[PDB]
RNA sequence: GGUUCGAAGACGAUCAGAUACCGUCGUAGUUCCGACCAUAAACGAUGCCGACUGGCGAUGCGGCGGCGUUAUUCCCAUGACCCGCCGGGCAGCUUCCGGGAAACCAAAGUCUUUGGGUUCCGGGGGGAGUAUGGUUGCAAAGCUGAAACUUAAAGGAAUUGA
């Protein structure tokens, strides 16, 4: 799992947790 | 020692408090995030009741249970 | 049993003509056979083991396992050596270590503390040696001090005649190896370092090759 | 695959050093003298070194061969080093001589020589090889 | 830029001294520098020298015998009493029987034993042995 | 090296670099001790008398030794001055 | 492990190189570390030579070269075998191979 | 020379030198050898100064005659150009010869059957003998060499500055040193020429030999 | 404004599958103007200023000196070669300077013989450049930045095998 890639997963899962936490704020 | 001057003691002691944050054995010691988690609370002993018997497994290379108590 | 020397220097030595492997230190000439130094120190001679260490390369078919083997020898004033040989049985390295530690014996010169009353006793001054990771640094100390070091170089230091001492080690000490030759590096440079009291100029004296080259041309040619 | 192995070669060369008047030119005679000469304990061995002594022979009738020294071969060696001419090549009646080091010899005590002769330094500092 | 001379003089000294030269050239010169070499040569680790005036600062050019093991600076130049002094010495000196730290006073430049012979304190310049 | 009393209790006095006054050491394999002979003033022929130079090994390692000796030859006159 | 040490490219002071085309595959290699040949050859190559000089209508006819400059990917240069893999100390030297044929 | 008129060079002497051409040099200089030159031509060699030659050259006869032992000085020559006039110097001066392939392991190797430990080593070429020179680096022996404008001074003791290349050149720096160790050693008188003619320290090359052959027969 | 190339997409191949490598077409983009963004193996994986410590042959700029060739021609002088010297610069070869765990480095040396000035910054491996708070941005994201918990190793240079 080259860390490039786990950057970018990690990144994605980062935007789906924001926009999680607007839709409830 | 990096920086040399007589009149750098205000430097070079404020670095050392920074870079003593770094040193994990001083991080735990000094805050008090450790100390809350610990389940003595600090304490050496501490007593407590019995709630069941149980057993866990060793780890990879070992096989036995491990007599257990949760208390 | 009898030796027979094949080394020029070996036949001096033997027909009982130069009086002290002491005067062969002097013209730092290169003793190449093992006879010389049991025949100036063979009664004083102590060996002692420093461990047997068993490398092994990896071959097609298995390991092939050698083991070597650290030996430090020396009279208990003035003289240390340190020799290392691996061979494929243990007792064969330790022969052959003795051999390599007896050819590589280095005086030692040993100093005051303080004021200079009896006999000396501590390293001259500070001195260092390096190996590998390991910094060795021997430091004078006051008389009945004792050696205060690790116990691999305590012992060499009890060979060497010194009796008190304070040290220093960085780095791995761990490898015995080169912790073990970092403290003979620091010993070996002990004359190696210039003192007021040696800044008096050298008398030459002229050489055995070169003062018994009658005896030499006739006995071997 | 007929190479011969060391220990035909090394026998051959030492019966070669040591019996070369004796030794002939063909193969049948000095098998004969290699068999009397020297304790050969088979014979396939025995004609193989005899083989090689033969093929020395005729490397060593035309020169000399590197590792091995028969008597004569050498005796004029020494003759041929010992060997000196009649007048020197170190004396001429005009030594070649550039301009420069007539002030090196000017700055020592010999001045001017007997038979030197001065010559034009060449113009044209061209000494160098092209880079490339 | 260059911001002490003494160091940068001693430093000079001792790599030319460590590969085995006869003379040294001291770019910079001053009352520090001339100084602190008297006090090197009374004790006869360096020869006799020679400090060039051009009407800037001059050079100086040095005399070198085989006796010196090393010449240092130390910085910033540490006030030292005279309980300080045996711990200094503790520290940057091979052994008791020679070796000197330099040390400036109100009496003048001079070294360590016998500043301690006229009992004044001072500051710390360098040693040498 | 003496004691208080006076007494030489150094092992032995070692040699020292004719050129560059370091110490030679004891397994200092690569130092020289060379001797030059001495002539006699009307003749030209050897007459017994040396003079004996030591030359440690970083000298010598370094490229200088010849030098070294070329300098301490005509510091006793061995060598012309001019040169 | 530092492996090469100019990087195996000839960048000393510039900071960048603009990069060419290889021309086995399109590879995007820096001008200065792609492998160039300079390749002369003759259009008729060894074995028509003497069939064109004999139908050629003029006499003594010098046939025209042909001047292509060729780059090289590392990638390609190893598999075309133009350059291929030496001893550690063997890397170091840097003179082209001999030139008499 | 020790500014001795017995020692100093003579008419007869440069002479030779300058047939020879020991004065010319090569088109490199290192930085050991700047001050055994003159100057530079415009032809791009150096020349070598005679007088610093000549006291080299004496000064290399001193040490040899200081080694009481004729037999354990050893004398190595692995270029074809010097082996003959090492076989001639040894023979003149008593001096153990090495000719040929320097197997290295001579010096310090006991256990081989060619184990010599000599007191001295002259050196027809620092960089052709580049071996002998290093195994003088392990046993305390000083060493000696012919050593052109170029050849590094690397463990060399007394370099003779010559041109240790031409096969004339070497041959004469062969001959006259065989000729200063006798004269000093006493068994030759200054006042004559030496019998033995230099020629018969030159290397001769195979192709001029069967020309002389012919011409003599 | 849009020639070429070409994320996405479409189809044809291959394949056990092939949302890929190969092929054809092709959108945003690739170009320019005016505004944002502030990250790259943004690398020499190597802070800046200053001093000292070996050679050698080159190369670029400027300057100085010198045989001689070659232009202008009509000789002076400027150009083009050639031979050196000086100062900055990009590098190179060699070295028992010295250092380094070594690979290697004329600096990565002048360090237990430890102090020229000064800035930034690391403290076993993960969790994790994550949670939270703050701040910047149109957005994408940037900067600052934990802990609980987990684990005896993770790792660097070199050696012999496979
Ligand atoms: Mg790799
Ligand atoms: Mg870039
Ligand atoms: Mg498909
Ligand atoms: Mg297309
Ligand atoms: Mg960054
Ligand atoms: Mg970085
Ligand atoms: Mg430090
Ligand atoms: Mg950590
Ligand atoms: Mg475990
Ligand atoms: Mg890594
Ligand atoms: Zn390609």
Redesign the interface.
Known sequence: MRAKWRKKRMRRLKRKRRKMRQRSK | GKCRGLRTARKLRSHRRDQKWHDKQYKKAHLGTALKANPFGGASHAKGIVLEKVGVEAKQPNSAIRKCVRV | KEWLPVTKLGRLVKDMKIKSLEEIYLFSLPIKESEIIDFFLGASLKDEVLKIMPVQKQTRAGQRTRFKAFVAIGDYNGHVGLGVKCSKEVATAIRGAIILAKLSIVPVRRGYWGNKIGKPHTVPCKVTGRCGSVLVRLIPAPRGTGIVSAPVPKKLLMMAGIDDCYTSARGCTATLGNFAKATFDAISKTYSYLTPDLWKETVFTKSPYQEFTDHLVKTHT | GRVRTKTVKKAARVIIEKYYTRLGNDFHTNKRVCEEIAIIPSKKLRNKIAGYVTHLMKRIQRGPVRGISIKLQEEERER??????EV?????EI?E??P??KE??K??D?GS????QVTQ???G?N??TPRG | VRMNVLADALKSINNAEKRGKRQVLIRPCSKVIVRFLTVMMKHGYIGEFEIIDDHRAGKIVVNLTGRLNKCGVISPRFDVQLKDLEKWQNNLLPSRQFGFIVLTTSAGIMDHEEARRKHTGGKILGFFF | MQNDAGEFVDLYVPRKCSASNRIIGAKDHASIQMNVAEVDKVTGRFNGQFKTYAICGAIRRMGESDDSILRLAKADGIVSKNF | TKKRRNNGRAKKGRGHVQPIRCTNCARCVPKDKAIKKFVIRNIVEAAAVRDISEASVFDAYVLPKLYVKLHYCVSCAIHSKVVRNRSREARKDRTPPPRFR | SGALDVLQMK?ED???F???GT?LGG?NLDFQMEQYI??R????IY?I???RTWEKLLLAARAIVAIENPADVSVISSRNTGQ?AV?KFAAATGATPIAGRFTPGTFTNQIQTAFREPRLLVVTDPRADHQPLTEASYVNLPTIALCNTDSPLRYVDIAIPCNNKGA?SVG?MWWMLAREVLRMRGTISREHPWEV????Y?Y?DPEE?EK?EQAAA
């Open positions: 041929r080093d010992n060997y000196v001419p020197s090549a170190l004396d001429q030594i001589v550039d420069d080091t090196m010899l700055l020592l010999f020589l007997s038979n030197l330094p060449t113009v500092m000494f160098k | 008419e440069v002479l030779k300058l047939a020879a004065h088109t003159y100057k031509k415009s032809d791009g020349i100064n005679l007088k003959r076989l004339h004469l003619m230099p020629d018969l030159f001769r030999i002389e």
